[PDB]
Amino acid sequence: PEMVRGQVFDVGPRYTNLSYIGEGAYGMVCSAYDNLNKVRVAIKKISPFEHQTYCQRTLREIKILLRFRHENIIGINDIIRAPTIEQMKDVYIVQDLMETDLYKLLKTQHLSNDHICYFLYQILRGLKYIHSANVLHRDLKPSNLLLNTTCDLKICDFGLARVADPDHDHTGFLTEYVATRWYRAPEIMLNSKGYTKSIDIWSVGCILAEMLSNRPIFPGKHYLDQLNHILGILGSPSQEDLNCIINLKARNYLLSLPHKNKVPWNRLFPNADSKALDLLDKMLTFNPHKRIEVEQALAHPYLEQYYDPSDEPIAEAPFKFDMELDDLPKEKLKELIFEETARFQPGY
Numbered sequence: 001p002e003m004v005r006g007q008v009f010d011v012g013p014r015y016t017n018l019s020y021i022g023e024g025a026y027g028m029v030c031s032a033y034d035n036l037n038k039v040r041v042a043i044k045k046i047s048p049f050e051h052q053t054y055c056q057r058t059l060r061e062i063k064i065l066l067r068f069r070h071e072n073i074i075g076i077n078d079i080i081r082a083p084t085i086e087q088m089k090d091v092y093i094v095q096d097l098m099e100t101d102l103y104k105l106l107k108t109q110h111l112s113n114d115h116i117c118y119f120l121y122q123i124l125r126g127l128k129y130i131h132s133a134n135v136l137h138r139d140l141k142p143s144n145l146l147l148n149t150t151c152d153l154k155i156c157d158f159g160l161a162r163v164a165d166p167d168h169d170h171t172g173f174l175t176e177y178v179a180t181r182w183y184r185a186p187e188i189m190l191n192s193k194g195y196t197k198s199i200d201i202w203s204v205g206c207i208l209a210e211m212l213s214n215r216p217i218f219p220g221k222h223y224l225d226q227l228n229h230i231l232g233i234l235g236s237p238s239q240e241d242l243n244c245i246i247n248l249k250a251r252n253y254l255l256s257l258p259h260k261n262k263v264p265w266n267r268l269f270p271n272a273d274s275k276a277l278d279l280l281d282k283m284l285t286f287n288p289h290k291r292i293e294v295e296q297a298l299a300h301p302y303l304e305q306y307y308d309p310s311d312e313p314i315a316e317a318p319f320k321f322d323m324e325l326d327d328l329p330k331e332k333l334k335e336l337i338f339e340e341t342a343r344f345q346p347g348y
């Protein structure tokens with residue numbers, strides 16, 4: 001097998017001339033030349049089989065992406081693994097080769113307002129499809145947004161996704177970890193399991209703010225610090241919004257804080273389009289029930305140059321229940337991953 005940085009990366013003979021380009025959750029990402037389709041591609045190595053949770057994250061993403069088909073979601077072109085379960089140690093997922101990700105791009109490039117508008121439109125267009133399938137991405141952040149050389153945007157990594165479950169979303173204070181910290185909605189720390197669509201809208205609002213300034217808007221230094229940063233800009237929640245938090249530990253924490261004023265968006269972003277800041281405000285709304293939904297966001301005046309509901313498709317076959325995976329031992333999960341990837345074997 002071909003090797004990359006002292007690691008097996010066993011994708012040949014179809015895929016050759018490998019280059020390291022980054023990291024996934026359970027292995028490295030490489031570019032490679034596809035000798036059949038005569039184009040370079042991206043390949044993610046996955047090694048999940050020693051751990052139940054890794055197999056869960058792997059199976060969930062494969063099931064989602066094999067059903068999804070959307071221009072702003074990067075799909076699965078091929079899956080490489082051994083012909084038998086005994087011989088299968090790793091799995092490789094082949095996908096379109098993009099130019100960069102938005103995290104890298106924001107490190108060194110200032111975005112024009114036209115780019116911010118186009119990027120945000122494409123994020124929301126893909127999110128509309130995801131949510132229409134009754135699915136939550138639950139880890140939207142710049143490093144999971146890929147861009148090609150003409151600034152087409154695709155959403156990547158569905159390993160943390162779940163089927164939406166708004167009727168079972170309530171939980172206690174300081175118990176939930178959903179998403180990457182800086183993009184985590186305030187209710188995660190207060191009373192939410194992250195089972196409703198508004199969790200994704202908060203993350204998109206954080207990404208919009210980061211596109212406006214090239215810095216994260218809520219850069220918590222650790223778990224507990226995150227809510228300090230959110231409240232420092234949004235200010236103290238209203239009485240109405242506090243009354244929506246029935247959990248006493250969460251509500252009394254907020255009541256124990258000194259008054260904090262709202263920081264006006266146009267003082268934080270003096271160069272920004274005023275329509276962009278209006279939409280930002282609606283996405284970064286404290287109360288998740290008052291927070292703008294994805295189809296409302298697409299119809300906001302900031303996006304008027306792009307908005308076209310007939311060209312913003314929804315899913316043909318939504319997922320009805322979460323795939324029943326927990327307590328399933330890793331052996332049954334390996335068997336399910338094997339079966340789910342069988343369609344790509346030479347043969348079939």
Ligand SMILES: C[C@H]1CC[C@@H](F)C(=O)[C@@H](O)[C@@H](O)C/C=C/c2cc(O)cc(O)c2C(=O)O1
Binds near residue numbers: 021096098099100
């Ligand atoms: C194989 C998929 C994985 C998608 C992604 F969600 C991750 O795994 C994250 O860790 C990313 O931050 C890694 C970056 C990947 C990447 C970078 C490019 O410059 C061009 C590309 O085509 C890809 C790509 O396809 O990545």
